[PDB]
Amino acid sequence: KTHVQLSLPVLQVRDVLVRGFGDSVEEVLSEARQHLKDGTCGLVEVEKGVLPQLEQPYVFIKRSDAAPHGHVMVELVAELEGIQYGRSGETLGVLVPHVGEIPVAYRKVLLRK
Incomplete structure (x- = not known):
């Protein structure tokens, strides 16, 4: 499918243990997409x-x-x-690996995959 329904755990920035996906633009997009497919991706609301x-x-x-x-x-x-x-609309948040941090909420998204 071109889109996948996901429910992303919303994490507090100070709880995040792994604070990015890697070292290059291509690696972080790659790893983000892998973690979204594997259900191991969290979301931090940008403030x-x-x-x-x-x-x-x-x-x-x-x-x-x-x-x-x-x-x-x-x-x-x-x-x-x-x-x-990339070029897109309003930021919903920044993606990070999820390694079992307790979320404050869930964000339902339809991810263009």
Whole structure:
């Protein structure tokens, strides 16, 4: 399928143990997509002070359209040293590995895969 319904655990930035997906834009997009397929991806909501506490390159989920079955349609955009790879809508959050941190909420998304 071109899209997959996922329910992503929303993590507090100070709880995150693994603060990024790797070392290059292509690696972090690759790993993000693998962890989304494996159910081992979390979401951190972006506010003042969050991104400097995580590791670049960043992987964002961004709204791809204006929400089937309560799932916002999203796609991935990476960022390294202020350059984004992809073009999309509003940021829903930054993706990180999930390694068993307790979430504060779940974010239902339809991921363009």
